[PDB]
Amino acid sequence: QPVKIGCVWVLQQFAACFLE
Amino acid sequence: MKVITCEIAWHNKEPVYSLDFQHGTAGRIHRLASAGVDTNVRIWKVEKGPDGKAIVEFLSNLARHTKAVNVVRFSPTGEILASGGDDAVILLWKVNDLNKENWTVVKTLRGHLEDVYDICWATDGNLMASASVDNTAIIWDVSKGQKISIFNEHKSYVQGVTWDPLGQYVATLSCDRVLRVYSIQKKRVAFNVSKMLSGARSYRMFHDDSMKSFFRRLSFTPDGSLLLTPAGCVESNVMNTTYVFSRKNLKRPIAHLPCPGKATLAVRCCPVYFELRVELMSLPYRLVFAVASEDSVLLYDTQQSFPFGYVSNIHYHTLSDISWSSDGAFLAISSTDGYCSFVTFEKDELGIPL
Amino acid sequence: NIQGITKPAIRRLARRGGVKRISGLIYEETRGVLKVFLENVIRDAVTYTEHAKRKTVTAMDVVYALKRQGRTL
Amino acid sequence: DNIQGITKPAIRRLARRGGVKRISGLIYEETRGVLKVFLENVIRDAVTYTEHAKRKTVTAMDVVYALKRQGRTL
Amino acid sequence: IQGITKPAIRRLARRGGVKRISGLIYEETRGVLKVFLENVIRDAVTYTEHAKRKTVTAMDVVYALKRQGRTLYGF
Amino acid sequence: NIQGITKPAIRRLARRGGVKRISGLIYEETRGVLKVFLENVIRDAVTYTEHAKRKTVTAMDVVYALKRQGRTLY
Amino acid sequence: VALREIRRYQKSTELLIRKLPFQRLVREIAQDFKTDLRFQSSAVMALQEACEAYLVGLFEDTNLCAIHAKRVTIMPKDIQLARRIRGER
Amino acid sequence: ELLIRKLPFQRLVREIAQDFKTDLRFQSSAVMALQEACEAYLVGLFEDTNLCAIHAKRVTIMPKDIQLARRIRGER
Amino acid sequence: RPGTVALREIRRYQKSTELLIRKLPFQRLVREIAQDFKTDLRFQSSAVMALQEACEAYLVGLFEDTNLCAIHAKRVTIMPKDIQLARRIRGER
Amino acid sequence: ELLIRKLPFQRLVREIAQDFKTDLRFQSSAVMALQEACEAYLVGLFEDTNLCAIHAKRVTIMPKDIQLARRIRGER
DNA sequence: GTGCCGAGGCCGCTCAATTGGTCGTAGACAGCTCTAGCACCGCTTAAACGCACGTACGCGCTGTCCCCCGCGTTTTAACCGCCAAGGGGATTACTCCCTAGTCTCCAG
DNA sequence: CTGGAGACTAGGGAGTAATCCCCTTGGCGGTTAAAACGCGGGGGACAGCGCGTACGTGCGTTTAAGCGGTGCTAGAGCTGTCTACGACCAATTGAGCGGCCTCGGCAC
């Protein structure tokens, strides 16, 4: 089964990165 | 959300490179256009099923382009269709009042030298901005259908041009690792963004030809306030990222959201503004937009720094293009494996529209 | 216009082309292909001048258009 | 030293489009010499053709005729 | 070169749309067969030495039909 | 036909051409290049004589053939 | 008498189309594109050379097709076939 | 679907490669890609030869028509 | 490893057609050779571009020929003797 | 002063002519001039392919040498 | 200036002499090819530099211009003898349809 | 690893199609009278190009220390070949019947 992620305002594992 | 991967071939299993949703549509059922290496642009009818699943209904096929088509776009009014291919020409299709609907060529925007990559539109509906492998961005008048402005300051292949919705500036990114932003009124380059400093050395903001994809389509905000640019690298080794700039200053990004591993290539914003549910720009409205990288799709909004949605492991090849729908209920993605995918959201899932 | 491409001129061009005898209406047709050629070789050539941001057509741009066509001379 | 304006990496790129791997350091002088000879042998013919036209300027068409005389028209 | 069969050329020409086929064309086709490859393969090796590999890839044919100006859709 | 250009003939031709030592397969590659050279000169000479309405082939046509090829010899 | 013309013309190289008619044809065909265009005399020379070379080659191969069909004359069918086989249309 | 047997074409490209240089192997995907390309080339040449034969109001193909189409195409 | 950069350069260049001998140094060289031949002579920009394209093609073709010459001599590196033999075998000088 | 045997080259050129167009006339002066042209071409090819061979520190001449000479001259 | 005519010039093919030219055999050995090891000399960033290169810009010269005209060579065009593109007819040639074998490349 | 049905080879059958000739009607090549547009050349300086310069800026060249792919150079190692010769062996000259198409010479 394919995996979808919907609208949230398990998602915590996919944070984008800055650079200091 | 829901994601449906089309297991049938749209362009005889050839890779799909461009999509667009009919912005002129004001209802719930949508019309889409797909461009493929089959030298054809196919207009399909996309509608959610009774269970909520997207259904694709073929409507028409356009074979006027001599060679493979790279970029296809619609006008803001939805009545004017611009198709770009490997023939270095732009075909203008209008309503003609195996195909179910009829499309007719009205204008032939000759004046491109090399492969065309990205086609940009104007809010007034009277202006074209187009980018090609000719290292040049060409600006045209619809009422005359002839070339009126030329920007040949790119030293390498141009893969994206975006027009400001307010109608003052235009942003072009080429393969020379240079971001050139021009004043449309002055018809001269105004801003150059190629090098950026972290912490105190300065390195290139963008990265060279190792992309396996053919598009670097950066986007303007529908309100024009922000510029979102993919295919960036940040030295933290280097990691892939997408940079955010504001109209206040176009030279330096305070924030970039990274995609370690594969590099982001296409970005597209929804035409529907939502009420507010770290923030890049602070106004009581918000906008939802999405970026297609090599093998994943990310979905952000105005406020959240981290992605609102993350969808991965769908296609077997590099994703080519992403296109939002008129009402925001559909998000069409195409890869270079010959098949496409759709992201469908329930009513007001992204938020409450303004 | 096209009638500048003169019938004895096509005669002599065919003679250098090695044609012994020309049918009477080839003249009414060959000029046609000339347009089909010209409306291409000129067509991109001017854009090249537009691409070089000059409004004068030059022999180098024409040679480039021929190179794209594949009949360089 | 005007002929020396044709840099070493320029000749190296010339070689790369020629389809080679290792360029010897002794070839730069020889390639500069042959290039100056070729430019001389084409410029003389172009100049004679332009003077035949009684013009004070040689245009892009004249050098094409000179190359046609040489045998590598382009 | 005899591996290219007579029925192969026959149904090739039939797909081409012809009705009647001679005999002397057959070997002739083999001729125009090999010379075609007799160019393409060289470019392949002209790329394979460039590729520094011993087994050719799918990019070699793409570049071959790009050089000859006869690019073909499909794989 | 071609076998009239015998091995010792090409041997003495090579000796007067300046090469001291000769291999085996040149004996056939030289016949091949001789055929390729003769085909063009014969074709163009035939065309010129057809232009002149001559079943014969005047030596003037032959020297003009060489001039078209570039190896003129009276 | 014709063979004399073919010989004496294949001998020479000078331009065949009259200068001014070709120049005015080029200018008129550029007018429909966009006005206010400047063409150097060298550019018109290049156009004349290209057009004459194209027609020389096309008439050579149409004569080829005609001699194929056992006809000394060349007909429009020859022009269409030499255009299609070459890939023009 | 293809109308040329895989093994004869494979062995002929192998021997021509050996004539070029030894130990130049071939992989399957390249083999079918080249076979498809040669398929299209030959079928196009045969279509042009059909047209040329139609010109001479004889439906049958003659050996020359092939060479005439070749030399018009500017191959040799 | 050494060599891969050369292959990447070949891929970048053979596909491409841009300029390698830089415009201004070639203009200077052409002007100097013109002054050597006869003074007070003017070279159009398109004329210099055409001349530089002819120069480009001549040198790339002769370097391809000298590549064939070096490959025949069973060595990848070129040398001036290869260039001399390529010129003589071409009958130029 | 010629080294290609005269009788054999005359028959060879007649047989070449019969391939192009049958019933063709060849005179002694034309055949002698053709012999001179062929001898000049072959002597030039042998001399400069000898140079190409001595380039590779070899004294003999193999087919690759003549092939390279012809390829460089532009005849292939 | 051109048509007829004579006369040589390749034909084309034998019919032989002897005659220089070519082929095949034997192999000692000069040389192609291979192998290996050395030094040496082209590929690689760091840092300096430096010079293409772009953009504007005052100054200036060579594309150039249409009008007449000078003329004048070439194009239009109608007449007309004459070659040839073509339909039809008869003739000879060469692939369809099994028939059978077979064979071998693909499949379990 | 072993098996067997779709595909390649020859052939009878003849039948459809390529080939060559027969007016034959049409239409395409001289040709002459001319004129008419083409080639050419002379100005005006208005308005447009390339030259040349200043600035910057930064992409690209330049040097060096550095190392390793590679030229080549010495030493086998096997191998075709140019030596001499002895056989064939095509064959040049010396003559022809017999000609016919061509090219220079001559006369009207």
| Helix content estimate of chain B | under 10%
Question: Quaternary state, please?
Answer: heterodecamer
CATH superfamily of chain B: YVTN repeat-like/Quinoprotein amine dehydrogenase
Largest β sheet strand count, sense and barrel closure of chain B: 4 strands, antiparallel
Number of strands of chain B: 30
PDB class: replication
Keywords: replication
Assembly: dodecameric
Entry title: Cryo-EM structure of human CAF1LC bound right-handed Di-tetrasome
Write the layout of secondary structure elements.
The complex is a heterodecamer, with 1 copy of chain A (20 residues), 1 copy of chain B (354 residues), 4 copies of chain C and 4 copies of chain G.
Chain A: no helix or strand
Chain B: E1 2-5, E2 16-21, E3 30-36, E4 40-48, E5 54-62, E6 69-74, E7 81-85, E8 90-95, E9 103-108, E10 116-121, E11 127-132, E12 137-141, E13 146-151, E14 158-163, E15 169-174, E16 179-183, E17 188-193, E18 195-197, E19 202-204, E20 219-220, E21 226-235, E22 238-246, E23 255-258, E24 264-275, E25 285-293, E26 296-300, E27 309-312, E28 319-324, E29 330-335, E30 340-344
Chain C: H1 7-16, E1 21-22, H2 26-51, E2 56-57, H3 59-69
Helix pairs in contact in C: 2-3
Chain I binds a DNA duplex (108 and 108 nucleotides) through residues 2-3, 5-6, 22-25, 42, 44-45, 75-77, 79.
